[PDB]
Symmetry: C3
Subunit: 310 residues, 3 copies
């Protein structure tokens, strides 16, 4: 046989929904004046903050948010649901255009809890891997540890997801599939990295001034990546939108509670692999259900397709 | 339109069943020579003491006790089940005569755990609110902290149920419904308040002498209400029955175990609202399944009914 | 009526499966060149090591292992499933030849958790009791505390299972059925008792030399039974097979990890009652799914049968 590169459009989204049910149309996030994606990868954090969900019970929030996402996908294409995976509040959805569904194979989904006692699901990661035509793809959604001072724990959460996440494989003989053994890796989530050094007022001033380049110089994810403690070999696109945390629910105002939290680029998307081009990377201010704003990126990704023989 | 007051009969019952399945006919509690209630409000504590129930799993005890209650309702009327709500061992049931069912609306049920780590369901409250004709009603069933020395925690459990219990409402714009925003509030449960100061032998002697007025002078709920720490604006009827805890299972004898627990009026019913009259308040000694006896009260409650226009 | 003793063949098996799904045919354990048993008693430990199973959720491992066992039963007889009981990873299955099913009655199953905080199901026991013809039988499967130094906790786990395990009974009037109130008791499990005194190299040398009599002189279960701290009145057959823990998964090699665990006869079967004869007691090295090997015993057991009147 013979293969060739054919480009497909992948949408990746991440949204921390603060334990809320969906109240708004999600088109403003998932299909806001874009061309129809070929593949949708849609991730949530904090789907359900209840004690019942924490102890691994089913939750109506799973179906509520799945339906909201399905209804918010681009109207020009029929999308097939390929896979849903959830650990407590961390949920990842994979859809493809119906016409591409026949070329999806080897779908596997797994989860890793890195929260209470290092194991519970209040924080951690979920992942879906699959083959699209002849290209292997893994999408990871992680919610890493909270608070500015806990960057070392965020680094450890990342390392633990990478080492513990193992996928099934057709051949029991080879070692299990890990996240890294894929042609294309998309990593999204509330990575929860904050702004070092600067005080809250200075952070807010830089944002008002739209000096995102200066603010980004103090971003913990940037610093840790530069120190090679996390996300080795991954790329992140330039941040041209304002921090996505923390807002008063129902508004675009920064947290006016007593805690008065410093804004942060909590919500991020990164990638690794050949033939990837990021076409956009943005937040969606119009959605106010949560104290975070959703983030999205659209990629053109080259996929190995088998040429038809005649 | 025009409204007028029409009286309906409400039965309220509370029973701590010590993790047991039902073994006796519940008519002796629920329909023991009384007129048929229009509305039944039936609450349990300790429905299931298992670790599985504690971690929020379904339990066969829910259906066993629901059926026992349904079978024990007054035989002269067909009762419609309006709502069931359970948190671990705390369950509340609401029924109305079939003929009144069409005038029930806006039924909402919620729970608040105030047990382990302040959040688990070994203690706490559940509630059902609804509109009957044009009158709003909230029924609360609480199981508050154990032991004579923990009255401050019982006070805190009450305050926490009051502040955390929020109900849905037709209009997202107004603040959520709380327990206090109702025309009629009925609060029942194992409130777990004990007798201060007196030693066990003195308590038992007063009960033998049927001097309930003297024993009540040392009741913690009375004292805390007088200090305005709990149940502000609520009324409780005079206690004319002997303490309902703690008995040897299968008997009317006081706890003969090594612990030799002091008797207490653990199990109580209180109310708040206009046009309420208590017609009775009693315990039911004949039921011996548990180490508590069940308590009941019947009220005449004035309800706002729309007058028919012709 | 008149009764007489008739002998039936009972198979008992215990297998700690290290949280794995079944990968091998279980005939090598359950029907490896033996006559068809009349009754199968098949016990597992560590069916599922997940946090979800630990908090008492259903697991697909239950059905996977039940089907594997059913498929591995002796092919000459149709076996009826009488009962399945599971607590977290501890599962016991009871089957009988179809032709004997009509003579099984009073089947009851219960569990006792003796793990975290003395109550959780990471360790403990499950049991099935029943009447076969006119003889009462109780089969217990226990997973007792780990590690050489914790023999006192293993003793306590045993005592706690014995005192807490209570079965339902036709007559509410008599005291509940306990394990000890049965004509025949079969106790199996990962009892987790280790070899005292000897160092790892010496243990391995004795095993190489096949000097099981000398190694057994240092076995903790033997010592504790002799001290009358556990298993009073029970018998165990001579151990003529090598220790069943701890192996590298997929091999017959001893644990080559850093921990380098000493081999132990973790997995045991004991009995108590009249008219019992052990016909075999062995391990099954050929099964390599787990870090333990399965153990089996076949008994001839005299059962009281009602003579037919003509
Ligand atoms: C081994 C099993 C037994 C263990 C039982 C222990 C139960 C328990 O303590 O969980 C605690 C867990 C903690 O949240 P965690 O994931 O750090 O995530 C939150 C962060 O995302 C931030 O947003 C912080 O809030 P903000 O930045 O202030 O907005 C932070 O709040 P705080 O600063 O207050 O830490 C925290 O709540 O909360 C939950 O997951 C909620 C549901 C479980 C609770 C029920 C059980 C009691
Ligand atoms: C964050 C998650 C992890 C937390 C795990 C922690 C698990 C745990 O310790 O729970 C303990 C919980 C305690 O009972 P709690 O509600 O005070 O209610 C009981 C009172 O109503 C009284 O009747 C007292 O008994 P009496 O007056 O003497 O009759 C009292 O007994 P004690 O005096 O002995 O305190 C107590 O049992 O018991 C239960 O709810 C039973 C079921 C859960 C246990 C399984 C988990 C191990
Ligand atoms: C009151 C409720 C809240 C309590 C939450 C606490 C959760 C928790 O710490 O559990 C711990 C529990 C411990 O295993 P436990 O039964 O001793 O059994 C194992 C033994 O059988 C041996 O094989 C030992 O391993 P090896 O001989 O080395 O092979 C030993 O390992 P270690 O030597 O390392 O002790 C141990 O894992 O592990 C589990 O059961 C696993 C699943 C639950 C964990 C999820 C919750 C975080
Ligand atoms: Cl927007
Ligand atoms: Cl009575
Ligand atoms: Cl073998
Ligand atoms: Mg939140
Ligand atoms: Mg009790
Ligand atoms: Mg193991």
């Amino acid at each position: 046989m013979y293969t060739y590169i054919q480009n497909f459009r992948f949408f990746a989204g991440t949204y921390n929904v603060n334990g809320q049910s969906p109240k708004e149309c999600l088109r403003l996030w998932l299909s806001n004046g874009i061309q129809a994606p070929d593949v949708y990868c849609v991730g949530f954090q904090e789907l359900d903050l209840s004690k019942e969900a924490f102890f691994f019970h089913d939750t109506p929030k799973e179906e509520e948010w799945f339906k909201a996402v399905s209804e918010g996908l681009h109207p020009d294409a029929k999308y097939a649901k390929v896979k849903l995976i959830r650990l407590v509040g961390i949920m990842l959805l994979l859809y493809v255009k119906q016409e591409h569904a026949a070329y999806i194979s080897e779908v596997e989904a797994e989860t890793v809890g890195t929260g209470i006692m290092g194991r519970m699901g209040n924080k951690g990661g979920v992942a879906i891997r699959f083959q699209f035509h002849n290209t292997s793809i893994c999408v990871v959604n992680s919610h890493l540890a909270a608070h500015i001072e806990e960057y070392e724990r965020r680094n450890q959460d990342y390392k633990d997801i990478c080492s513990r996440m193992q996928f099934c494989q057709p051949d029991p003989s080879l070692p299990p599939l890990t996240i890294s053994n894929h042609d294309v890796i998309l990593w999204l989530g509330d990575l929860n990295y904050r702004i070092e050094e600067l005080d809250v007022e200075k952070v807010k001033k830089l944002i008002e001034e739209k000096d995102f380049q200066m603010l980004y110089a103090y971003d913990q994810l940037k610093i840790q990546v530069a120190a090679k403690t996390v996300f080795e070999g991954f790329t992140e696109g330039e941040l041209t939108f304002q921090p996505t945390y923390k807002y008063d629910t129902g508004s675009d105002d920064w947290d006016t509670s007593e805690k008065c939290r410093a804004p942060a680029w909590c919500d991020r998307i990164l990638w690794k692999g050949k033939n990837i081009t990021q076409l956009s990377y943005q937040s969606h201010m119009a959605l106010k259900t949560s104290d975070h704003k959703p983030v999205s990126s659209v990629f053109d990704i080259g996929v190995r397709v088998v040429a038809h023989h005649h």
